[PDB]
């Protein structure tokens, strides 16, 4: 499930994070890259991110762990998340309700992003994005 062309691509990306070149990615270097992108990460956010990936628990990410993360079921999780907002137990919510949850909660997507998912996720063409269509789009 890993091309050899993918492995070298991920090695290059690894390099952009590990700027000291000691084969490791620390919370400071992740912070440095994210601020370089104009983002404003919290020190807990940086810790959650390192923790999710750091399989050995030594507080840092080296390249095999990076490789695993980029290579890594999710379906049922996405389904549970959609059902949280499922009021009437139907397989869907209105596009307006979807636009609200996507723009006003959690990460807060932009309105052009939500336009994009809405256009792309109505696979069957009837004007109504349902859950199953949304899942298939992502899988």
């Amino acid at each position: 499930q890993l091309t050899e062309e993918q492995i070298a691509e991920f090695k290059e990306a690894f390099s952009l994070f590990d700027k000291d070149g000691d084969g490791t990615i620390t919370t400071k270097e992740l912070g440095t890259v994210m601020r370089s992108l104009g983002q404003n990460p919290t020190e807990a956010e940086l810790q959650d991110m390192i923790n999710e990936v750091d399989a050995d628990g030594n507080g840092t990410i080296d390249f095999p762990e990076f490789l695993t993360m980029m290579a890594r079921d999710s379906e049922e999780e996405i389904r549970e998340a959609l059902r949280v907002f499922d009021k009437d137990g139907n397989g869907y919510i209105s596009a307006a309700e979807l636009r609200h949850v996507m723009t006003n909660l959690g990460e807060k997507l932009t309105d052009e992003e939500v336009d994009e998912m809405i256009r792309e996720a109505d696979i069957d063409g009837d004007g109504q994005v349902n859950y199953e269509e949304f899942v298939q789009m992502m899988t």
């Binding site: 992108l37 999780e77 907002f85 990460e107 992003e113 994009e116 992502m138």
Partner: protein
């Protein structure tokens, strides 16, 4: 209800992973403080979106 924020973030970071595989997506327009998004930018963005998706997944499961 601890689940509403967790579940929204899961949806949003999942879609943001997905949108980043398309180079023309409007998801690339949110980095307002970069004038010219180049190759090295996109690659670090791809990595940060994947990590955030994995954080959101653990937090959702932690809320259930």
């Amino acid at each position: 209800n601890r689940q509403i924020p967790a579940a929204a973030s899961l949806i949003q970071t999942a879609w943001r992973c997905y949108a980043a595989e398309n180079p023309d997506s409007s998801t690339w327009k949110i980095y307002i403080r970069i004038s010219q998004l180049r190759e090295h930018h996109r690659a670090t963005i791809k990595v940060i979106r994947r990590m955030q998706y994995f954080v959101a997944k653990k937090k959702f499961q932690q809320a259930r």
